[PDB]
Amino acid sequence: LNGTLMQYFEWYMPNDGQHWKRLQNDSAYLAEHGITAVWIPPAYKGTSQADVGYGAYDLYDLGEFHQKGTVRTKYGTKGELQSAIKSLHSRDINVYGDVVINHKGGADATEDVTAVEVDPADRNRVISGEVLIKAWTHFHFPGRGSTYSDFKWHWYHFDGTDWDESRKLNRIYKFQGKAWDWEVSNEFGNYDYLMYADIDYDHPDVVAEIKRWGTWYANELQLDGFRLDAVKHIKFSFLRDWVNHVREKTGKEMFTVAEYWSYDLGALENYLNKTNFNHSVFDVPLHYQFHAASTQGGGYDMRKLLNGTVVSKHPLKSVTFVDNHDTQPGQSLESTVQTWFKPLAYAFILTRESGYPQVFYGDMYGTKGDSQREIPALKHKIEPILKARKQYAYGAQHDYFDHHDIVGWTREGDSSVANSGLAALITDGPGGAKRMYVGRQNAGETWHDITGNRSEPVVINSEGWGEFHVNGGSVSIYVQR
């Protein structure tokens, strides 16, 4: 059975505390369409109730304690989340929790700290003498106390910050005696620092504490895996060790995928090598190819889709996706795949043999931002493709990328899955036909377009070939009638 992941959130969902209840109500629907795992947004207390979750204030407050002016997180309470997870597990759906450990935001109080300013363009370069600043670095968790963990954070557990409260100044400050971690992205010289208070992974106590929390988090929510946030800003060797640690302590597989945001395949391959391939990464390069194809009105050379992607070289270490919360309208990395091309992009990630595909909540149900270009609900267009993956995308694959517009691939089917096998065609330009091999064992079968875009069926000839058609700027996926 093919595995399919779903990112279960988008950036602009309402702050109504009903999200965990929604996820629970959706478990039957997800199982029906072949979703086998869900990645949920950060479940711990952020800087305020409305925090999407990346501010990460208290990793041990899963919407359980009265802190930051609220008990629940934006998504609901700990009990509601546990109930949703139980519902998903009852239907054999795995749950991956988001892990935000690059920084900590929303400190309870400031501390006087001696620091120096560094060059934003080259953080290895100090551009000032020592200065006494007031930094938001004291975390004592007034509403939780010592429940679950007595660890308290201070300035010396961090490498730096971007704000001096005493002068109300936004500059990148590195604390006295600290050094940016390595290895991390070399963008801007050293990209250890991103935002809020940056965790110092050179600190022994911090290393031990984040590992301990990881195990606690997995056990408390009975997680099956993780999605790692902003890894290009976190010491690579630490991430490698953290993943191994949690797997060792829980004794579970703990599938893990990391968000290393880079357009460059080279940087992604370096990260994989440095973490000894013990976890996967999102295929960011492929997302940008989809965006480019969708915005070039047919001028994109579709043959490029087979090269320069993580999945092309590391088929078992890539999580493929079309859009996500970073790329949706209104966000800093906005690069949304245009609606007309979106079904074609989904066919590419859902019916091909390599990669672990991920469906976006925003693409299924629409995004709720305030722009005039929000993503509309496309679940009606994606559901047929999810069915194709669940029931038909099995067996040997054959690729036909011999044209700048019309490209396709087939899956011969596998005898262990009744009536499996398919032929997919997509085109970013004018429609047409392509003769493709689907396996001599399918000779004589009548296949039809499960998307409903084409009404005429195709009969497989004696030598296992079929002449398949596709409409302009569209997708057709043929399966046995």
Catalytic residues: 229, 259
Residue 102 marked as a ligand binder: yes
Interface with Ca ion in residues 417-456 (CB under 5 A): 428-429
Coil, helix or strand at residue 439 = coil
Q: How far is the CB of 223 from Na ion (least distance, A)?
A: 25
Contact by Cβ (8 Å): 223, 217: yes
Single out the residue of 26, 162, 164, 198 in contact with Na ion (rule: CB under 5 A): 198
Contacts of residue 358, Cβ cutoff 8 Å, sequence gap at least 6: 4, 5, 6, 7, 39, 282, 319, 320, 321, 324, 349
Helices of type H across 112-264 = 204-221, 236-250
CA–CA gap between residue 94 and residue 459 (Å, rounded)? 39
| Partner interacting with residue 202 (select from Na ion, Ca ion, none; CB below 5-8 Å by kind) | Ca ion
x/- site string to Ca ion, residues 75 to 104, per CB under 5 A? Answer: ---------------------------x--
Is residue 200 annotated as involved in ligand binding?
yes
Nearer to Ca ion, 200 or 229 (CB): 200
Residues 6+ apart with CB under 8 A from 344: 293, 426, 427, 428, 474, 475
Spatial neighbors of 245 by CB under 8 A, at least 6 apart, are: 211, 214, 215
Binding at 405: pick from Ca ion, Na ion, none (beta carbon under 5-8 Å per type): Ca ion
Any binding-site annotation on 233? yes
170 to 189, contacts with Na ion by CB under 5 A? 181
Residue 395 CB neighbour total at 10 angstroms: 22
Residue 164 interacts with, from Ca ion, Na ion, none (CB under 5-8 Å by kind) = none
**Smaller CB separation from Ca ion, 203 or 252:** 203
3-state secondary structure of 108: coil
Give the DSSP H/E element, type plus range, for residue 115: strand 109-119
Q: Which residue is nearest to Na ion (CB)?
A: 159
* C-beta of 298 vs 308, nearer to Ca ion: 298
At 336, which amino acid appears? T
The answer to whether residue 192 forms part of the interface with Na ion (CB under 5 A) is yes
Q: Does 162 bind Na ion (CB under 5 A)?
A: no
Name the binding residues for Na(+): 159, 181, 192, 198
Q: Contact positions toward Na ion, by CB under 5 A?
A: 159, 181, 192, 198, 200
Q: Contact positions toward Ca ion, by CB under 5 A?
A: 102, 159, 181, 192, 198, 200, 202, 233, 298, 300, 404-405, 428-429
